[PDB]
Amino acid sequence: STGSATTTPIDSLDDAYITPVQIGTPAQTLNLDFDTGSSDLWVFSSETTASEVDGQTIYTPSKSTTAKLLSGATWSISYGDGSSSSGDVYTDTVSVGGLTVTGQAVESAKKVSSSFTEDSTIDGLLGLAFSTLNTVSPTQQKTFFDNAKASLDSPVFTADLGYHAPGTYNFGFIDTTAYTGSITYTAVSTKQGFWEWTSTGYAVGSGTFKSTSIDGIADTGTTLLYLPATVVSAYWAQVSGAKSSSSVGGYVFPCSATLPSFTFGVGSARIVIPGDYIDFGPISTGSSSCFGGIQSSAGIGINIFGDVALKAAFVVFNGATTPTLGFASK
Ligand SMILES: CCNCCOc1ccc(OCc2ccccc2)cc1
């Protein structure tokens, strides 16, 4: 089997992407944030505290003839950005782009943090990291990809995120029309439950490439590119008037600037992030100070190849017995 779904930016900055997901019988379509940095499929629901729902579409398990309470199961997650959610668990039929899993754990939120409430466009998350991170207790549950894997034509999914435009998540096949040149594959460590890999280095604009190992995660659920402070300082030093602002919480730059590109290595291959991808717009409405799309990871404990990086590439998440990542230009 295969599946193919379009993923759409939630706003004009590509702050996140949403993909429609069918849950239950008859189908209830929710727009989920596909997150290769987490492993829980959770939704706004009929159980969510009423004051914490503000325009999201909810899953109502009582209206699904295939929904079954997973007795005694709870979940609770806290994300790297400080957001959180928790609740109970149903199993139900879940389809993405034509690919159906029966018996998927659908984690129904009873509580969500303010950042979720305040974003009307995201109805929940669909985690695509390794199932070892799933938070369901006392019986850990599998991701949608892990449940689909054995049925797929190939045990893969691909992320093809757009810059200020829709893109695609495919399951079970690699669309050879969706990229240029060849896909370079690189080793993955699953030891922290992430799609963790080692970039071979970077360049700033037309500058010389610096060969250096940068360990990090391929994370579709993180907006920005978070890299070591040395690399980030080297990038922003090429932008007149850019500075790290403790008050704003990262590097800012004059909105009048034209940003340089940023290149990262994948083995001997190179992925070039155009400068425009690194502009996250005014820090506050009407400001001439703009927020940067490349930020330090120093305060995180891991480097994160988030959407800024991944949207410059066609990315293969290869769930073969030994997982690997593939990157192509496009
Ligand atoms: C650790 C990162 N990845 C997992 C958490 O992913 C989130 C997704 C959405 C969200 O909603 C608020 C929001 C949306 C867009 C950009 C900034 C913040 C919070 C967290």
Curated annotation (Swiss-Prot):
Q: What residues form the catalytic site here?
A: D35, S199
Provide the disulphide bond pattern. C255-C290
Q: Name the family.
A: Belongs to the peptidase A1 family.
Give all residue intervals belonging to the Peptidase A1 domain.
Answer: 17-328
Lineage top rank: taxon: Eukaryota
> Which Enzyme Commission number(s) are listed?
3.4.23.22
Protein keywords: Aspartyl protease, Disulfide bond, Hydrolase, Protease, Signal, Zymogen
Query: What protein name is recorded for this chain?
Result: Endothiapepsin
Q: Name one GO molecular function term.
A: aspartic-type endopeptidase activity
Q: Which reaction does it catalyse?
A: Hydrolysis of proteins with specificity similar to that of pepsin A, prefers hydrophobic residues at P1 and P1', but does not cleave 14-Ala-|-Leu-15 in the B chain of insulin or Z-Glu-Tyr. Clots milk
Q: Which GO terms describe its biological process?
A: proteolysis
